[PDB]
Amino acid sequence: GSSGSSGPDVDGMITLKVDNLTYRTSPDSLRRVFEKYGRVGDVYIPREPHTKAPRGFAFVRFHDRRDAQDAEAAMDGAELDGRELRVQVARYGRRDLSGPSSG
């Protein structure tokens, strides 16, 4: 099969990483931070290997590949919580995959 549909399936939605997030932060808030531009498919906040606490960065899924790009630049580089929140895409895990180049 060759990917070419949408709806009842998720190929690989865009993922945005948000660092400099204080404990006070929660799925709701983090969800309202992006929801402003583009709804959030899912919200996850990794924790310490031992302690169940937001290590430091969070994961936010999006629907389109545009909204995310906007919130990324817009947010990243703003004055929040008395600091410069790092709202950008994850470090690793490319959103693309090798395969049929021409087909």
Report the alpha-carbon distance of residue 30 to residue 44 in Å, rounded.
9
Solved with: NMR
Show me where the domains of the chain are located: 1-103
CATH number of this structure's domain 1-103: 3.30.70.330
> Contact 67/74 with Cβ under 8 angstroms?
no
- Exposure string of 8-17, with b = 16+ CB inside 10 Å and e = fewer, is eeeeeebbbb
- Exposure string of 73-87, with b = 16+ CB inside 10 Å and e = fewer, is eebeeeeeeeeebeb
